[PDB]
């Protein structure tokens, strides 16, 4: 669409792949204001608005928050507050032809500066002079919209650029627009930090005999923490068991009698004892021994 | 516009407190490596503020000075009160190096 009559498309109830936009080549500028330009793709927004227009490169620098320009004042206005990404890619190949292209046009003259996110499509003759235009061309009166001239020979500064502005709004609403995750892979019988559909815990994951109802997602524990989970990709119940924990007790005779000590790890099998994250290996540091032969369960 | 004042538009990670980065390396936003030259989705890290006299108050330049104060058992040289004669053997309010 032409810049003065910029076209707004509402994006909702879908997962937004911003990373594909990042991957896509020929994007001359990808500037995100307020929102982080990368790693905030996952963040959920109530609605996403895409505003589409064709403008010159100088006008492309003009379209930013808190910037004064003719295109800013009389065609498309960007508020300082909004969090959004402005994307521009060079369109010389398809937006230009011989003898100029009249398809894209901009408003030279407007009575007042445009309010943010407001489009004016009025074609009424601009009354710069005190005398009224009367709806016809007159002295001091000119048509509001002047057609852009786009040519293949035309320099890069004057070359047409296609710009899509993405506006993100957060409100008291479901925020269906979001960004998906890679989702990694299932790890079983190993202590791990697990996120299942936004539920976070640290525990060993094992196959679960119990069968949930189809709608049901997670098991119940007294703390309200999960005792079981259902994997989202494959509907298999997984038991959650805590990673091994216990107290460490030093059994020591009196220091006057001896400096020899024994250590009793609590409620742990001796197989887990070597991985006790002792700072030094083969030396009796923090723990009396981990590979010692005097081991009694 | 005044180009002298610059800010870092793109950085790979958030800065640690009281850490200054002066690197001018091109930011690899795009999947393709920049290779030290401007490319698609490759941008210079520092963007100049546009500073103009007519510019709005929100967009006007502001000079900022941040003062850091240390509270320690060290000599505490930066004191900035008037000293009084030491009084001993009787109960008194005292201020020693703050």
């Amino acid at each position, epitope marked *: 669409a032409s810049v003065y009559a910029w076209n707004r498309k509402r994006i909702s109830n879908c997962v937004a792949d911003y990373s594909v936009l990042y991957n896509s080549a020929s994007f001359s500028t990808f500037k995100c204001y307020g929102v982080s330009p990368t790693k905030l793709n996952d963040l959920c927004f109530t609605n996403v608005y895409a505003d589409s227009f064709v403008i010159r490169g*100088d006008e492309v*620098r003009q379209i930013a928050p808190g910037q004064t320009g003719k295109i800013a004042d009389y065609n498309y206005k960007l508020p300082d507050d909004f969090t959004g990404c402005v994307i521009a890619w060079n369109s010389n190949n398809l937006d230009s032809k011989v003898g100029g292209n009249y398809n894209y046009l901009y408003r030279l003259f407007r009575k007042s500066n445009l309010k943010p996110f407001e489009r004016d499509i009025s074609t009424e003759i601009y009354q710069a002079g005190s005398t009224p235009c009367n709806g016809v061309e007159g002295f001091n009166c000119y048509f509001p919209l002047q057609s852009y001239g786009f040519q293949p020979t035309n320099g890069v*500064g004057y070359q047409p650029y296609r710009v899509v502005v993405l506006s993100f709004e957060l409100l008291h609403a479901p925020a269906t627009v979001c960004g998906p995750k890679k989702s990694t892979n299932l790890v079983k019988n190993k202590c791990v930090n697990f996120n299942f559909n936004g539920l976070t815990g640290t525990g060993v994951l094992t196959e679960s005999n119990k069968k949930f109802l189809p709608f049901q997602q997670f098991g119940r524990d007294i703390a309200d923490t999960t005792d079981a989970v259902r994997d989202p990709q494959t509907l298999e119940i997984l038991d959650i068991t805590p990673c091994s924990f216990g107290g460490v007790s030093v059994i020591t005779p009196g220091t006057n009698t001896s400096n020899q000590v024994a250590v009793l790890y609590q409620d742990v099998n001796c197989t887990e004892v070597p991985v006790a994250i002792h700072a030094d290996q083969l030396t009796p540091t923090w723990r009396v021994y981990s590979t010692g032969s005097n081991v009694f369960q | *516009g*005044n*180009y*002298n004042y610059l800010y870092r538009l793109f950085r790979k990670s958030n800065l640690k407190p009281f850490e200054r980065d002066i690197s001018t390396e091109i930011y690899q936003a795009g999947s393709t490596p920049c290779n030290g030259v401007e490319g698609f989705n490759c941008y210079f890290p520092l963007q100049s503020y546009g500073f103009q006299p007519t510019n709005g108050v929100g967009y006007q330049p502001y000079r900022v000075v941040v003062l850091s104060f240390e509270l320690l058992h060290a000599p505490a040289t930066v004191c900035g009160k008037k000293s009084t004669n030491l009084v001993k053997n009787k109960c008194v309010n005292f201020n020693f190096n703050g």
Partner: nanobody, 115 residues
């Protein structure tokens, strides 16, 4: 420090085309915007034109506009002011100016232009 040397001012017939090349040295030319100031003989100073550091945004005086065009080359470090349809009133000693009214203010020795 900052040295400005103006080259290209000479006697011209009315209606002639004259280009004045302000040459910079000792600083980053691209960073600083440049100004042109004329001094008509026995008259006060008259600002002619200002080009921005980027150079896309050029402003001119009402009389100056449509007769005088300003330009700059970052690689050559020179600001070119082009004057066309020259008049007797145009005659002045033009001076290169950098960052007028600010701490970065520089001044050029100037060249006499006579029409």
């Amino acid at each position: 420090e900052v040295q400005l040397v103006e080259s290209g001012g000479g006697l011209v017939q009315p209606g002639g085309s004259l280009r004045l090349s302000c040459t910079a040295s000792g600083f980053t030319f691209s960073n600083y915007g440049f100004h042109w100031v004329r001094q008509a003989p026995g008259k006060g100073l008259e600002w002619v034109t200002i080009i921005s550091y980027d150079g896309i945004t050029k402003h001119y005086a009402d009389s100056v506009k449509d007769r005088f065009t300003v330009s700059r080359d970052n690689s050559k470090t020179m600001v070119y002011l082009q004057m066309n349809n020259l008049k007797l009133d145009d005659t002045a000693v033009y001076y290169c100016a950098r960052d007028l009214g600010t701490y970065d203010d520089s001044w050029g020795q100037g060249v006499l232009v006579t029409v």
